[PDB]
Amino acid sequence: GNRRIRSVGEMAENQFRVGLVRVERAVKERLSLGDLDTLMPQDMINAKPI
DNA sequence: TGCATCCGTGAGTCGAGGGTAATAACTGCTTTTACGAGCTTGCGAAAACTGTAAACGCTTATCCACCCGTGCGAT
C-alpha cells in the first residue's frame, strides 16, 4: 500500500512535460525579443527538443 | 573525548544488441592554399647494328694398323 505501479502511458507523459519545459524557455525569450505584428506561432515553436 | 564530516570498499566467467542531440549572424575585405594546365629532363624500352672465340651442320690434309685386292702355297 506504500508502493505504486507506473506504466507506459504515465512514464511517457512525464517525459512529455520535460520536453514542453523547453518550450517555456524559448517562448518567454521570444515574446520580449521578437517582433509583434509578424510573429506566427509556427515561427516561435521548435520541434527538436520536444 | 567524544562528536561530525569524510574517503573507500563491495566474487567470477560469459553473454545479447548498439549509439545521440539542444543551439549559436551577418557583412566587406585581404591573405593563404589548393587544383588543373603546361613544360622539361630522365629513365626504362624497342629496333637496329659493329667487335670475337667458339658457333650449329659439314670437306680435306695426313699417319697407321686391324681387316684382306689378289696371286701362289698347306693334307
Answer for A49: CB within 7 Å of strand B: yes
Q: How far is CA A42 from CA A2, A38, A46, in A?
A: 45, 11, 8
Q: Return the closest nucleotide (C1') to the Cα of A50.
A: B22
Method of structure determination: cryo-EM
Q: What is the rounded radius of gyration, in angstroms, for the C-alpha atoms of chain A?
A: 16
Q: Return the closest nucleotide (C1') to the Cα of A46.
A: B22
Question: Are A30 and A41 in contact, with CB atoms under 8 Å apart?
Answer: no
C-alpha cell at A25: 524557455
Strand B nucleotides in reach of protein CB atoms, 7 A cut-off: 21-24
Question: Are A47 and A37 in contact, with CB atoms under 8 Å apart?
Answer: no
